[PDB]
Motif scaffolding. Structure first.
Motif, PDB file in Angstrom:
ATOM      1  N   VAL A 222       0.837  -1.203   0.000  1.00 30.99           N
ATOM      2  CA  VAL A 222       0.000   0.000   0.000  1.00 30.99           C
ATOM      3  C   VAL A 222       0.873   1.255   0.000  1.00 30.99           C
ATOM      4  O   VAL A 222       0.638   2.193  -0.770  1.00 30.99           O
ATOM      5  N   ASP A 223       1.915   1.279   0.841  1.00 26.04           N
ATOM      6  CA  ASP A 223       2.824   2.423   0.848  1.00 26.04           C
ATOM      7  C   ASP A 223       3.515   2.594  -0.497  1.00 26.04           C
ATOM      8  O   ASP A 223       3.706   3.722  -0.965  1.00 26.04           O
TER       9      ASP A 223
ATOM     10  N   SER B 163      -7.997   0.423   0.325  1.00 28.97           N
ATOM     11  CA  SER B 163      -6.993   1.060   1.170  1.00 28.97           C
ATOM     12  C   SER B 163      -6.953   2.551   0.873  1.00 28.97           C
ATOM     13  O   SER B 163      -7.522   3.021  -0.113  1.00 28.97           O
ATOM     14  N   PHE B 164      -6.255   3.309   1.726  1.00 33.64           N
ATOM     15  CA  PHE B 164      -6.136   4.741   1.452  1.00 33.64           C
ATOM     16  C   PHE B 164      -5.441   4.999   0.119  1.00 33.64           C
ATOM     17  O   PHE B 164      -5.706   6.018  -0.534  1.00 33.64           O
ATOM     18  N   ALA B 165      -4.564   4.077  -0.313  1.00 30.66           N
ATOM     19  CA  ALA B 165      -3.901   4.227  -1.601  1.00 30.66           C
ATOM     20  C   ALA B 165      -4.892   4.175  -2.760  1.00 30.66           C
ATOM     21  O   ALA B 165      -4.680   4.844  -3.768  1.00 30.66           O
ATOM     22  N   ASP B 166      -5.982   3.401  -2.633  1.00 29.07           N
ATOM     23  CA  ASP B 166      -7.002   3.389  -3.686  1.00 29.07           C
ATOM     24  C   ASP B 166      -7.613   4.769  -3.879  1.00 29.07           C
ATOM     25  O   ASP B 166      -7.835   5.203  -5.014  1.00 29.07           O
ATOM     26  N   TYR B 167      -7.933   5.466  -2.781  1.00 28.62           N
ATOM     27  CA  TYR B 167      -8.558   6.776  -2.929  1.00 28.62           C
ATOM     28  C   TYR B 167      -7.580   7.775  -3.526  1.00 28.62           C
ATOM     29  O   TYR B 167      -7.971   8.618  -4.338  1.00 28.62           O
ATOM     30  N   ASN B 168      -6.307   7.701  -3.128  1.00 25.97           N
ATOM     31  CA  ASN B 168      -5.310   8.598  -3.703  1.00 25.97           C
ATOM     32  C   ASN B 168      -5.078   8.279  -5.176  1.00 25.97           C
ATOM     33  O   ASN B 168      -5.059   9.187  -6.016  1.00 25.97           O
TER      34      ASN B 168
END
Ligand SMILES: N[C@@H](CCC(=O)N[C@@H](CS)C(=O)NCC(=O)O)C(=O)O
Length: 209
Positions: free
Chosen positions: A89-90, A149-154
């Protein structure tokens, strides 16, 4: 509401964390900072790095857009299922941030002269994310693992702003194209993206897109 977002009246570096909050059914306060308020100087001087966004989770005050994303991901369960997925994810988010920085440089410092080279270079910048999707359940779920994950939204925001800058830039990438359509149709996110809160803000602060 537990959360406060302090930012200019722009989508900008708050679009992804707002999409996350809306899609996760969270409540938050928008503190909208006008340019005249910013130029008065006092709020800026109180910001750790002299910049916005500023974010509050109760008494916890944060700066840095990706710090806010990681905080929400960590506390709301949007950071993969184990340590290996957290690292992946990072890796995605850092790739998103790198391309966002290039986008920001184009928008604010070199739009006229730089756009053609930027768009012609864009397929090689987007290909890594198609490749990541191709390696995770045939691109049918999320960018890492089987949960958002937050990466999907970014990543979703990065893709949307590039569709505006360069219409058709995802056409060569079938997994990214389907991914944008799928995530954008999630009911709470769909409603948020259609709401005036989102639609009536400019993407950037200088009128370019
Ligand atoms: N690395 C920071 C970038 C912060 C940033 O660029 N803030 C801009 C708005 S997007 C700003 O406050 N500009 C006003 C100034 O620098 O005086 C982050 O990700 O939050």
């Amino acid at each position: 509401p537990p959360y406060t977002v302090v930012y200019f009246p722009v989508r900008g570096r708050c679009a992804a964390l707002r999409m996350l909050l809306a899609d996760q059914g969270q409540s938050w306060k928008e503190e909208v900072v006008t340019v005249e308020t910013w130029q008065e100087g006092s709020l800026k001087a109180s910001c750790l790095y002299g910049q916005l966004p500023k974010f509050q989770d109760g008494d916890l005050t944060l700066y840095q857009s990706n710090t806010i994303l990681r905080h929400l991901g960590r506390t709301l369960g949007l950071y993969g299922k184990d340590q290996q997925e957290a690292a992946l994810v990072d890796m995605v988010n850092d790739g998103v941030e790198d391309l966002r920085c290039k986008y920001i440089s184009l928008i604010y410092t070199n739009y006229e002269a730089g756009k053609d080279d930027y768009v012609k270079a864009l397929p090689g910048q987007l290909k890594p994310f198609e490749t990541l999707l191709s390696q995770n359940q045939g691109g049918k779920t999320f960018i890492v693992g089987d949960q958002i994950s937050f990466a999907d939204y970014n990543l979703l925001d990065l893709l949307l702003i590039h569709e505006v800058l360069a219409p058709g830039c995802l056409d060569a990438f079938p997994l990214l194209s389907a991914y944008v359509g799928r995530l954008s149709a999630r009911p709470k996110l769909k409603a948020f993206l259609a709401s005036p809160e989102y639609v009536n803000l400019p993407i950037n602060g200088n009128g370019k897109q």
